[PDB]
Structures are given as structure tokens and as C-alpha cells.
Design a protein around this ligand. Sequence first.
Ligand SMILES: NC(=O)[C@H]1CCCN(C(=O)Cc2ncc3ccc(Br)cn23)C1
Ligand SMILES: [Zn+2]
Length: 139
Amino acid sequence: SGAIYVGNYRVVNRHLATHNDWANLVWEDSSRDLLVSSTTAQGCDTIARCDCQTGVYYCSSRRKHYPVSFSKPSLIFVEASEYYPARYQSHLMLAVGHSEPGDCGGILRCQHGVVGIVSTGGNGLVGFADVRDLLWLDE
Ligand SMILES: NC(=O)[C@H]1CCCN(C(=O)Cc2ncc3ccc(Br)cn23)C1
Ligand SMILES: [Zn+2]
């Protein structure tokens, strides 16, 4: 679990969005596993606007942060799950690092700010949904 809180927005994994997220919907994209909802309070986070390919993510299943080298956002095949049919997920970045079911929502950061959130993984890989192209989160 986990979310990004920036301005009057909350960014979560679309498959973990709550009834309240859907009632306050701003934007969602199944192909990215992202949903953005509106908030009443001002958020604590800031968003990176960069092309970094290294950073640090939070791994809830280890209660620890780990450094990672990750691929640029791209279209990557994701096998069927209870939440989605077998499909290509867009704007996804992969890295070698531990993740297991339950780690979705952990934040990836570089020196410029928040880069994305954990969205998939397995077998020593971790995959992050990128948010750096969503320039409207800043206004
Ligand atoms: N983005 C998606 O389509 C995910 C929706 C939830 C389901 N998806 C998964 O990957 C579930 C899953 N099985 C093994 C692992 C290991 C690490 C992590 Br993080 C998640 N994992 C796929
Ligand atoms: Zn950066």
C-alpha cells in the first residue's frame, strides 16, 4: 500500500483505489495502473521533472529503502492477475530489487523528487509506474 500526496491530489495504484478515491476521481488509466483523486488538505510530496535512471525506493515487505538502477518508462507485458487481464502496461520502469505482493504503492525517489510508485514485480524484479510526465499534478 501507499500513495503520493501532491497539492490537492492523491496518486495511488488504480487497482488499490478506494470507494472514496473513485468518488473524488480526477483521472485514471488502466494501462498505467494509476488513479488520481482530489483531496481537501495540501499534500506533503513534490514530483521529479527529470530523466534520472537511478533512485531509492521504499520496500514495505522489508521495512527498508533500497537503491536501484531502472529502465526508462516503456510498454511491458504483465501477466493476468485478479485485477487485470493479460496486457501491456505502459509508462512502466523495471529494476532489480526485492518486491512481493503487498509492496505496491511504495515510492521511488531521485534527488529531484518523487519518480513513481511500485506497481508490479517478482523473481528479484520491482516495477514502478512513472508519474514524471503528469505535469498537471504541479498546478
Ligand atoms: N500492475 C499490475 O498489473 C499488478 C496488479 C496487482 C497484481 N500484480 C502483481 O504483479 C502481483 C504480484 N505477484 C507477484 C508479485 C511480486 C511483487 C509485486 Br509489487 C507484485 N506481485 C500485477
Ligand atoms: Zn531526478
